[PDB]
Amino acid sequence: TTTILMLPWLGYGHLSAFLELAKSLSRRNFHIYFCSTSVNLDAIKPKLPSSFSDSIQFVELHLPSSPEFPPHLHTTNGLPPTLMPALHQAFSMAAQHFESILQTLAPHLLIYDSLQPWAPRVASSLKIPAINFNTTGVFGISQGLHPIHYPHSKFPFSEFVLHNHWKASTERTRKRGEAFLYCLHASCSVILINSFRELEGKYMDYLSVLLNKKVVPVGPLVYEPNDEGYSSIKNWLDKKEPSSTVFVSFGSEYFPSKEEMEEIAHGLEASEVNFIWVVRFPEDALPKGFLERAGERGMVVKGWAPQAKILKHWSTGGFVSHCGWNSVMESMMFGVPIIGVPMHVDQPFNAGLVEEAGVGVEAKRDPDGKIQRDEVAKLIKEVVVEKTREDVRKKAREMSEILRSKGEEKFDEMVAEISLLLKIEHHH
Ligand SMILES: C[C@H](CO)OC[C@@H](C)OC[C@@H](C)OC[C@@H](C)OC[C@@H](C)OC[C@H](C)OC[C@@H](C)O
Ligand SMILES: O=c1ccn([C@@H]2O[C@H](COP(=O)(O)OP(=O)(O)O)[C@@H](O)[C@H]2O)c(=O)[nH]1
Prior knowledge:
Elements: E1 3-7, H1 12-27, E2 31-36, H2 38-44, E3 56-60, H3 84-92, H4 95-105, E4 109-112, H5 118-125, E5 130-134, H6 139-149, H7 164-167, H8 170-185, E6 190-193, H9 197-211, E7 214-217, H10 230-238, E8 245-249, H11 258-271, E9 274-279, H12 290-294, E10 298-302, H13 307-312, E11 316-321, H14 325-334, E12 338-340, H15 347-357, E13 360-362, H16 373-385, H17 390-404, H18 412-427
Parallel strand pairs: 1-2, 1-4, 2-3, 4-5, 5-6, 6-7, 8-9, 8-11, 9-10, 11-12, 12-13
Helix pairs in contact: 1-2, 4-5, 6-9, 11-16
Bound molecules: ligand POG and uridine-5'-diphosphate.
The ligand C[C@H](CO)OC[C@@H](C)OC[C@@H](C)OC[C@@H](C)OC[C@@H](C)OC[C@H](C)OC[C@@H](C)O binds at residues 141, 144-145, 148-149, 173-174, 177-178, 180-181.
């Protein structure tokens, strides 16, 4: 049996996408070692059906631990952002344990994420072929690589303009970019990416030319379940009108500021929409009286919600999203129009891609980068409450139809490249 060890970055969204890719590989009769920190393995295990456990085995990676940085914090999930430097540093210090794991398990292939340049180096030292898998889409990566090669030309295949809020140490930034690009460039023969050609084909081809490396899409990778609070939520959703409710979430690794929560809350209130809002803490940052005024229209879920089940509910008409890539792919698979409120990293690019696909809208920030309650209210009003953006709802339905027609064949290209790479390296 051919064995693959998979090393996601320590972010719940990365674990999620890597687990869906592991399932696709298990169905092609690979044996998978799924490697992460215990706190991340615990978080993702509920998403693995028992039928996979014979072929997808979890393997704990150990980071340096201390009372001030214990194992429960060895994840980005709900991590204070000022511990993010420590998390990256501790992950790099796991390379020795990672080498021991690779020596013991001797997988035929490593699949690694883009936040760990040390991982392909350890694999190479053990003569283990290694392929990079990106859990993001292509658009934002190509937008980041383009100015390196064409600093005085506009990106060629879009009308997207990055807002100044995101455009604003330079050396530290260059080194982070170099480490990220190294993970892609170091990949053996191909880069795998969680995207699909109907959405990003021309950006895939452009990225491939810029990197001079083959880009192989393996998306859409969307988890679908079959009671983490769902029964109460379902009963509440069941009593709403069709497509009347927005889900509101900013993902697993971001806490909006009190100022940002103020604007989102007032936007939800003015829109008069039904809403389910996931609020997380690393105190109450909602405006005084907001929930009491919302009454039965509003529901705040503390900590974590069953996002997929909510998005699939007939009562859900829109998704106010930070536009993390898994949330975007889920919303497209499920046919739910996105009202984009991106926060940082790849999110502003994901929102512009959503807007340019016509399957959602982006709430624009003010010149100084502040969220606008009037823009949130307007877009929820148009897309969900009044549904005067029929064009967006139609495009979102059409995208869901395309994504639902995809099957196992979306993994054919990856499987062929794995087969070739292993047949070549066995000779070497
Ligand atoms: C995250 C995003 C990217 O997706 O931002 C990354 C960015 C911040 O990284 C900047 C860094 C990669 O600068 C590279 C630069 C040195 O390359 C210049 C290029 C034109 O070749 C020059 C010359 C022939 O080659 C010199 C080189 C080969 O050593
Ligand atoms: O309350 C929540 C919040 C998020 N998610 C899931 O967590 C992942 C978030 O990944 P994404 O790429 O959207 O952004 P990130 O959280 O990593 O910034 C997605 O699969 C969501 O469905 C969830 O199940 N419940």
